Amino acid sequence: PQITLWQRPLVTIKIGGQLKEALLDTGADDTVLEEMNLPGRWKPKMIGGIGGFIKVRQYDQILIEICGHKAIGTVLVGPTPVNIIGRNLLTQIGCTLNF
Amino acid sequence: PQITLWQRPLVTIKIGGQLKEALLDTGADDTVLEEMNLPGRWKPKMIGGIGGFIKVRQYDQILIEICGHKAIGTVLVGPTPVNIIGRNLLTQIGCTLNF
Ligand SMILES: O=C(N[C@H]1c2ccccc2C[C@H]1O)[C@H](OCc1ccccc1)[C@H](O)[C@@H](O)[C@@H](OCc1ccccc1)C(=O)N[C@H]1c2ccccc2C[C@H]1O
Numbered sequence: 001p002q003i004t005l006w007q008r009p010l011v012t013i014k015i016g017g018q019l020k021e022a023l024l025d026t027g028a029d030d031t032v033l034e035e036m037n038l039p040g041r042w043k044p045k046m047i048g049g050i051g052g053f054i055k056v057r058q059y060d061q062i063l064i065e066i067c068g069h070k071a072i073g074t075v076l077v078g079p080t081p082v083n084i085i086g087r088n089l090l091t092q093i094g095c096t097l098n099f
Numbered sequence: 100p101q102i103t104l105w106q107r108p109l110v111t112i113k114i115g116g117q118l119k120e121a122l123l124d125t126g127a128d129d130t131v132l133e134e135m136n137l138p139g140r141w142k143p144k145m146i147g148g149i150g151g152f153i154k155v156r157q158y159d160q161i162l163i164e165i166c167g168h169k170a171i172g173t174v175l176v177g178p179t180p181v182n183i184i185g186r187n188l189l190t191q192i193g194c195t196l197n198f
Binding site: 004005009024025029032035084090095 | 104107122128145146151165166168183186194197
């Protein structure tokens with residue numbers, strides 16, 4: 001599909017059987033979701049954006065479904081204000097920026 | 100032009116006769132640039148990101164060239180980690196997300 005940017009580019013994602021809303025963020029290197037439970041072991045990590053840094057938990061090889069497209073990659077979980085789908089997963093679904 | 104996301108979507112922008120590098124960010128509602136000098140009066144604004152809020156200066160009707168495409172709009176200036184081209188200007192150059 002082609003997403004215009006008059007409004008925030010929010011889409012529905014499926015992860016861990018749960019359905020959620022998330023923002024397609026080309027400015028985010030990684031993907032970070034609000035506090036939730038995921039399987040496997042995790043690694044602590046600090047990520048910084050506008051405003052400073054936050055502590056998140058890193059999970060690897062997590063399967064996410066974005067608008068029907070399956071994608072695999074690292075998923076961070078932490079006190080983020082909104083769910084964010086970063087570049088690490090946007091590339092997997094063939095997402096691009098077009099002027 | 101089509102831009103993949105395997106790397107940060109960095110482009111060159113021209114503002115105040117100067118060349119700068121900035122990030123095309125669909126996750127940013129507004130455009131914020133690192134500390135610099137702009138003409139006219141400014142208004143105060145608070146923007147919230149991943150790690151909290153920051154205070155920025157708001158300038159209106161600023162001319163800015165993004166990859167050869169001229170745009171005129173609101174530009175914010177403050178302690179941002181990188182120069183950011185947000186949705187307010189991305190829509191002016193007809194930028195869309197595609198997959
Ligand atoms: O933090 C970032 N990346 C980092 C990131 C994110 C997730 C995981 C890892 C990493 C590392 C780094 O790439 C990106 O910034 C550039 C950036 C790049 C590199 C280093 C630092 C910053 C994001 O795309 C932010 O732009 C955007 O974040 C999503 C968000 C939307 C709405 C509300 C709260 C948060 C955000 O903060 N948006 C707000 C904003 C921004 C500018 C002007 C106005 C407004 C209002 C609101 O829309």
